[PDB]
Amino acid sequence: GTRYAGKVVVVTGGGRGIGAGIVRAFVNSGARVVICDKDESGGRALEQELPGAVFILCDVTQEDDVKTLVSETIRRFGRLDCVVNNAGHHPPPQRPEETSAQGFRQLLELNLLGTYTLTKLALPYLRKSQGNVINISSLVGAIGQAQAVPYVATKGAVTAMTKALALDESPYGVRVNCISPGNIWTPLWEELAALMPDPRATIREGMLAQPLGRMGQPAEVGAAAVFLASEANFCTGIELLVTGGAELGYGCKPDI
Amino acid sequence: GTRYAGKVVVVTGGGRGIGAGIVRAFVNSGARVVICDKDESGGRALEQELPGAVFILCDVTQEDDVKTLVSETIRRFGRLDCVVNNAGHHPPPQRPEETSAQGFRQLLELNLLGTYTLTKLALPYLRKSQGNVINISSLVGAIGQAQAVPYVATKGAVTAMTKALALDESPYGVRVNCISPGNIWTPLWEELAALMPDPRATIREGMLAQPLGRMGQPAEVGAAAVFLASEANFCTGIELLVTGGAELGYGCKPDI
Amino acid sequence: GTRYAGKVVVVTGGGRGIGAGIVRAFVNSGARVVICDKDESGGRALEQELPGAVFILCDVTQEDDVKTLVSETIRRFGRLDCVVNNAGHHPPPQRPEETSAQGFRQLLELNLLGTYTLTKLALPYLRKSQGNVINISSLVGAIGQAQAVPYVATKGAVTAMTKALALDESPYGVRVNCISPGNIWTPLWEELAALMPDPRATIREGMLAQPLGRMGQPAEVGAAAVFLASEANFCTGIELLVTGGAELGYGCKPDI
Amino acid sequence: GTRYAGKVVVVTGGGRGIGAGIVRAFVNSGARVVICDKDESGGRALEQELPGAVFILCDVTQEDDVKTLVSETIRRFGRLDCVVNNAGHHPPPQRPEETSAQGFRQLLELNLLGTYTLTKLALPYLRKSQGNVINISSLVGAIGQAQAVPYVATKGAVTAMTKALALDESPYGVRVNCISPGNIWTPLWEELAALMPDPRATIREGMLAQPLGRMGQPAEVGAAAVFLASEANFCTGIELLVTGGAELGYGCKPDI
Ligand SMILES: NC(=O)c1ccc[n+]([C@@H]2O[C@H](COP(=O)([O-])OP(=O)(O)OC[C@H]3O[C@@H](n4cnc5c(N)ncnc54)[C@H](O)[C@@H]3O)[C@@H](O)[C@H]2O)c1
Ligand SMILES: NC(=O)c1ccc[n+]([C@@H]2O[C@H](COP(=O)([O-])OP(=O)(O)OC[C@H]3O[C@@H](n4cnc5c(N)ncnc54)[C@H](O)[C@@H]3O)[C@@H](O)[C@H]2O)c1
Ligand SMILES: NC(=O)c1ccc[n+]([C@@H]2O[C@H](COP(=O)([O-])OP(=O)(O)OC[C@H]3O[C@@H](n4cnc5c(N)ncnc54)[C@H](O)[C@@H]3O)[C@@H](O)[C@H]2O)c1
Ligand SMILES: NC(=O)c1ccc[n+]([C@@H]2O[C@H](COP(=O)([O-])OP(=O)(O)OC[C@H]3O[C@@H](n4cnc5c(N)ncnc54)[C@H](O)[C@@H]3O)[C@@H](O)[C@H]2O)c1
Ligand SMILES: C=C(c1ccc(F)c(O)c1)c1cccc(-c2cccc(O)c2F)n1
Ligand SMILES: C=C(c1ccc(F)c(O)c1)c1cccc(-c2cccc(O)c2F)n1
Ligand SMILES: C=C(c1ccc(F)c(O)c1)c1cccc(-c2cccc(O)c2F)n1
Ligand SMILES: C=C(c1ccc(F)c(O)c1)c1cccc(-c2cccc(O)c2F)n1
Ligand SMILES: OC[C@H]1O[C@@H](O)[C@H](O)[C@@H](O)[C@@H]1O
Ligand SMILES: OC[C@H]1O[C@@H](O)[C@H](O)[C@@H](O)[C@@H]1O
Ligand SMILES: OC[C@H]1O[C@@H](O)[C@H](O)[C@@H](O)[C@@H]1O
Ligand SMILES: OC[C@H]1O[C@@H](O)[C@H](O)[C@@H](O)[C@@H]1O
Ligand code: NA
Ligand code: NA
Ligand code: NA
Ligand code: NA
């Protein structure tokens, strides 16, 4: 309740899924939180539910939306300590030949350039507060994923960008880290599974992809984010895996 | 002279630097090589110099240029075995606040989407030949670099994309690998150093950034590419470091 | 004060340095802590200082010492939830030709097999409590270090062993993670620096090896350990870097 | 036939499996090769088969055997250019509680200290020749393996040691690299599979653990070793994966 008292946090895509779990974790640590989302439904209800969280409608791909997000955060709360770049999307499975450069550009706009834009606009205020940036990347940026060339590329970019920016902002006391979740049970996971011939089988495979035998929860990503913000003062440029061990060992993926 | 005899290779940005070193290595291994470049000067001279190499003017950011590159390769040589996605650029040092989303998009077009586009157009022919893709990424995609947020992000994306595509194309016998060079002495390195207050000091630092005490050569990247194409039949999705050890150990980058 | 209330933690080498910082962090989170050390001086004073910590003399290289450590922990506190394998040593700088197989074996006994032995003896009790293992490895296991072949090898082994054991113990709900610190200001760091021709210069270099410009603190490693024990329920087999960014970018470590 | 002409190579455990594939690759590149093995059967036959290879009986865990191996290589061939530390063993599957510290020590003697000992005794001659070291580690040192805590630990140590030694020997022009194979079809693989309830099923799983759908061959590891020795002049401290992509993506290894 006090680990991050008196601090101000912006969470993009905070209306549902991982983002909402990160919102709740920061509120529970004593922070005031600005929920940014392009859709009103979840975020507006979360603002009613949580004292200390407020909702601001903002599409992170629209630069003037993000400019307003930052200026309204400062106007209303007087400081900015942490930005969590969580907004992002996973398209359905697509074979390489079914992808397009246009679709690839549009996904880069959300998953990469939206993170870039908010970070850039927030950094002057984070420097004043010796605050920090937390990017939500993905395990599959590191190890790959099938039928997801554009998504994997965007997350490779986020993880790498995190390290570059950590180098540049270290002289100013601003840390820049990322979390790479694996399979987290969210509305996006549920939506993608419902597209499959056997959704139930897809979900069962997703649970057994982890040595721990289950998918992760938004609250567990949220706890990792609170750690990075509030207690990881000698961490910068790290990639914090929240994956249940999916990257470990051999699995189903004589010598001719 | 025979390790890759009878094979056909496309090298983008093959007119100078690393690309020209890769062109020479493949010619020396017995392959026929198509030199793709947006500038004529170097590539046209290389075509005159090397029996077995020919030059095709092609800007990899222009989709119809790349369509023509592939169709002309097939028309002239009847097969395609390896594409080397080397074309790319490093902008001058830029502090994060000096970058723009527009500049970032333009660098993504070259360093990432140009690699994507040629790979996509070539894959039908690589499937027929059980050929392979070699992407030239960078060490700094893995470890970061100062004053280079956009460049680092693009190379993070290339390395990650390499792994995704290796997964998707493995059922068809097409391997997809990347090389991550460190400091290689090229015209781009020389151009960037000439921008500095003390170019000579910049070059000296660049040499001592490697435990081996020197920068790398285009020929050394070229040898790694020939290995991946011709002898690495159980390698796919790997990142082959050609860096002189720059990523090893501690260097210049009490507890408060 | 309550994040790990009611839990019982063993910290090896807890008498000073990183180990004592981990002891304090767990006490501050509400846990009861058993301080294991081969030397009495620091650990006995820490037991007097901290309600909720007690000292047990134990050399982790002596199997019967470790057997007694575990049985006394259970006898006195009735459960065991977390073991932190921190005991370890860094020999002075040694050129490869100045090392011996005998010295290498002895360092393996402490840095690797002592971690192995306590983990093995504790696992039956950790299974009952759904507890967890935290190994203190090092950044240099991942990236190397000069004049330290035996030390680097031992830490490579610890990090790898962490992943293997995480796989084996995941069906039982026992997580196994490691922390890889970089330069942490401790008595061992101070002792090694005092061996150098210019200790002050050695310490200054050690501070500037991190983008953050300082060495880390035992308290910061301790906070990472409390996170892994108490809040990282979907993390297993991870390597949590606490290094101030030392692994990022180029530093001091034309093409002939 | 000429890539490594006039050079002298020692391959430990060269009598069968990966080691014999590395022997053949170097002979085919023009090198003279000393086959070291503790068993005579395979290595003696290979010496009869291959002009340019000779067999020396040597147990790499016995220091005087290794001293004699080096002195006999120099006495007979007058130089030493490359040592390939391939000798090693994988014990049968063992649950953590079924392992012993004694068994762990014995495996460290072979997989780690035997590599250390030959490297140390060879380095004076490698410095004279500007030669290189190639260690055969394993993919599972990086990602873990089930029921193999001691084996995984030894390979974690080898990979890490490779980087440390590359740092120390770089001022002298001696490169130190490792190869991390995945599933390679060898007599050891066949022996381990025959221990299983369903050997055929074990072998089928082993083939499908790779995106490429097969196990690797000793010849493919051998080609990687020849590359590292003869053409990778700007590579030191690297880990060259020869795994068929087993480390990529998700596999078989809702949120509670
Ligand atoms: N769910 C997983 O298993 C998983 C795994 C790894 C990484 N991730 C990453 O975590 C993040 C969140 O994923 P999730 O599963 O919670 O997804 P989700 O779809 O359930 O929630 C994403 C939220 O972001 C919002 N959003 C989308 N586009 C936006 C935009 N342009 N501007 C503002 N808000 C926008 C959505 O409206 C939604 O509220 C994404 O970056 C995703 O790539 C998810
Ligand atoms: N030089 C290094 O130290 C270094 C290190 C790591 C990675 N790399 C990468 O290696 C690649 C080559 O770098 P370099 O140093 O040889 O650079 P360079 O500038 O010397 O050569 C690049 C070549 O690509 C061509 N090119 C540029 N844009 C193109 C386009 N749109 N279409 C076609 N051709 C185009 C240029 O005309 C030039 O001939 C790049 O991807 C770079 O990021 C270089
Ligand atoms: N200090 C750093 O920069 C640094 C960096 C990376 C990793 N580490 C690791 O962190 C751990 C602690 O390092 P530190 O700097 O705090 O060292 P330290 O020497 O200051 O403290 C180590 C403690 O362990 C105890 N110990 C040593 N051998 C023991 C044994 N056989 N049985 C029981 N206790 C034993 C010592 O008596 C001492 O109290 C070690 O594993 C070290 O490798 C340290
Ligand atoms: N086969 C795989 O899938 C695989 C995968 C990754 C790594 N590796 C590694 O590759 C290496 C070779 O494995 P392999 O499958 O070819 O094994 P193998 O058992 O088929 O061959 C190993 C050879 O080493 C010899 N040897 C064993 N102990 C020795 C000693 N003390 N001194 C000298 N020679 C000794 C054996 O007699 C044998 O000829 C080992 O280091 C192993 O860990 C193998
Ligand atoms: C949201 C998904 C996801 C899963 C793991 C990650 F690491 C990540 O970043 C996102 C998800 C959920 C179900 C299916 C898929 C999916 C989509 C396209 C191609 C695939 O191979 C998938 F598994 N992703
Ligand atoms: C071309 C350069 C380069 C160097 C190393 C790499 F890994 C890479 O991919 C590219 C280069 C050469 C000189 C200077 C710089 C440079 C540019 C901007 C920011 C920096 O920190 C730089 F070192 N890059
Ligand atoms: C205790 C030291 C240390 C530093 C960094 C690490 F990641 C680590 O695990 C331990 C330390 C402190 C001062 C000097 C040295 C040292 C010792 C031998 C060889 C070297 O290159 C060193 F830097 N280590
Ligand atoms: C020789 C085996 C092996 C397989 C992959 C590697 F990366 C490696 O270094 C060695 C092998 C072959 C069959 C079975 C096993 C095995 C043994 C014990 C535990 C396991 O989980 C295994 F797969 N290893
Ligand atoms: O829809 C899948 C899951 O999404 C998560 O974000 C919610 O917290 C869960 O209540 C829900 O079951
Ligand atoms: O311009 C720097 C270097 O670029 C390389 O591509 C050329 O091969 C060298 O001859 C030249 O010195
Ligand atoms: O000796 C170096 C440092 O060691 C740490 O363990 C102590 O907490 C510090 O007080 C001390 O300055
Ligand atoms: O025994 C398994 C395999 O081992 C390899 O070392 C041999 O080259 C193969 O001929 C054999 O099939
Ligand atoms: Na509210
Ligand atoms: Na020509
Ligand atoms: Na006490
Ligand atoms: Na012979």
Describe the model.
- It is classed as oxidoreductase.
- Keywords: non-steroidal inhibitor, 17beta-HSD14, oxidoreductase.
- It forms a tetrameric assembly.
- The entry is titled "17beta-hydroxysteroid dehydrogenase 14 variant T205 in complex with a non-steroidal 2,6-pyridinketone inhibitor".
- 4 copies of one chain form a homotetramer.
- The termini of chain A are far apart.
- Helices cover 48% and strands 14% of the residues of chain A.
- By secondary structure, the first copy, chain A, is an alpha/beta fold.
- Chain A has a single domain, classed as NAD(P)-binding Rossmann-like Domain (Rossmann fold, 3-Layer(aba) Sandwich).
- The longest helix of chain A is centred in the middle third of the chain and has 29 residues.
- Chain A is built from 9 helices and 7 strands, in the order E-H-E-H-E-H-E-H-E-H-H-E-H-H-H-E.
- Chains A and C meet through helix 6, helix 9 and strand 7 of A and helix 6, helix 9 and strand 7 of C.
- The site of one copy of the ligand C=C(c1ccc(F)c(O)c1)c1cccc(-c2cccc(O)c2F)n1 has 15 residues of chain A, from helix 7.
- One sodium ion binds next to strand 3 of chain B.
